[PDB]
Amino acid sequence: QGVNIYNISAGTSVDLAAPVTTGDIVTFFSSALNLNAGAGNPNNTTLNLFAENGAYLLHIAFRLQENVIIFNSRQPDGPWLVEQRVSDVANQFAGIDGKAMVTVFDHGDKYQVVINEKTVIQYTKQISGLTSSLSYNATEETSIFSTVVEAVTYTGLA
Amino acid sequence: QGVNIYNISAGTSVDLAAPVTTGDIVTFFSSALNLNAGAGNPNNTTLNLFAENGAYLLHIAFRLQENVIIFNSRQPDGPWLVEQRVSDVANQFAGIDGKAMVTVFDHGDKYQVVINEKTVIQYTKQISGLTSSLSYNATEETSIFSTVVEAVTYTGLA
Numbered sequence: 001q002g003v004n005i006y007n008i009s010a011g012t013s014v015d016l017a018a019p020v021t022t023g024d025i026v027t028f029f030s031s032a033l034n035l036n037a038g039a040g041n042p043n044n045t046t047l048n049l050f051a052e053n054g055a056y057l058l059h060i061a062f063r064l065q066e067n068v069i070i071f072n073s074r075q076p077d078g079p080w081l082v083e084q085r086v087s088d089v090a091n092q093f094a095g096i097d098g099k100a101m102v103t104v105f106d107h108g109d110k111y112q113v114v115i116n117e118k119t120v121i122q123y124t125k126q127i128s129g130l131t132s133s134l135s136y137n138a139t140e141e142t143s144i145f146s147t148v149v150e151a152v153t154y155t156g157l158a
Numbered sequence: 159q160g161v162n163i164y165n166i167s168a169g170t171s172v173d174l175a176a177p178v179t180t181g182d183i184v185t186f187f188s189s190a191l192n193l194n195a196g197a198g199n200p201n202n203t204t205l206n207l208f209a210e211n212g213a214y215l216l217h218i219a220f221r222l223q224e225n226v227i228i229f230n231s232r233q234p235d236g237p238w239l240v241e242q243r244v245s246d247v248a249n250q251f252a253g254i255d256g257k258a259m260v261t262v263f264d265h266g267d268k269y270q271v272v273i274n275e276k277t278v279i280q281y282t283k284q285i286s287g288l289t290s291s292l293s294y295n296a297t298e299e300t301s302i303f304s305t306v307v308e309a310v311t312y313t314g315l316a
């Protein structure tokens with residue numbers, strides 16, 4: 001029942017006018033792909049969905065040198081929980097180059113992550129709640145995405 | 159439940175691998191916005207949703223000369239039906255510049271059309287059914303959108 005657009009500058013965060021909850025959708029749009037960027041720290045790029053208290057509902061980290069895409073969560077001031085892994089980063093973006101899109105479906109019990117058309121994981125949540133903020137973290141030097149990524153939300157669907 | 163990406167060239171149509179039904183979403187992305195493109199004939203740009211028999215479930219037309227946006231439907235062979243229109247094109251796009259996106263929510267009994275974050279209309283259907291294909295008609299010379307439009311679909315939502 002509603003669309004929202006956010007330009008997220010590399011290394012910043014954004015508060016949602018409308019929170020993302022069960023049945024809602026969020027897609028991050030990048031106008032570039034640099035699968036040949038520098039060494040991650042260890043992350044080249046990360047995309048996150050936060051809850052009101054600041055907890056990491058979903059942590060999406062892209063690492064070229066480690067050639068893996070990690071997923072995890074963690075309480076506001078606690079340790080990282082059980083992380084999930086998907087090897088071969090460049091392979092998840094196959095089919096499209098020059099740009100890319102990362103979608104996260106809030107399925108209530110899980111976070112379905114899809115890169116372009118390919119579902120990368122059915123991430124069972126380790127932490128529950130509603131998403132009230134998003135972030136795109138990376139340096140201008142080593143990000144695999146454009147300096148500014150556009151987050152599009154589709155809320156009020158259920 | 160997933161995502162599908164289609165690169166549509168002005169004047170062509172495309173068949174959906176995943177049909178769009180009640181509870182589903184389609185968004186056309188344009189990488190430009192020329193509001194000085196010239197006069198339509200009478201249309202500058204049109205975006206359409208088709209049933210399997212060719213009928214126009216939803217027809218959206220942008221006309222700069224008439225400074226109005228049109229919505230309608232019609233059977234493969236029948237005549238256009240009751241035209242629904244909204245004035246001031248530029249106003250609908252106010253907010254973002256070198257680009258634009260148009261979203262359509264299939265609400266079963268209505269198609270909600272949102273430009274960027276602005277709902278332009280809650281279109282009561284004149285014809286119902288699932289969307290089997292899409293199209294984007296315009297010429298290079300007067301289209302208000304980029305020469306190639308990217309439609310993205312989110313299906314299996316309901």
Ligand SMILES: OC[C@H]1O[C@@H](O)[C@H](O)[C@@H](O)[C@H]1O
Nearest residue numbers: 200201219228230238239241
């Ligand atoms: O009612 C919608 C129709 O309006 C006509 O005037 C136009 O020639 C058609 O292309 C279609 O847009």
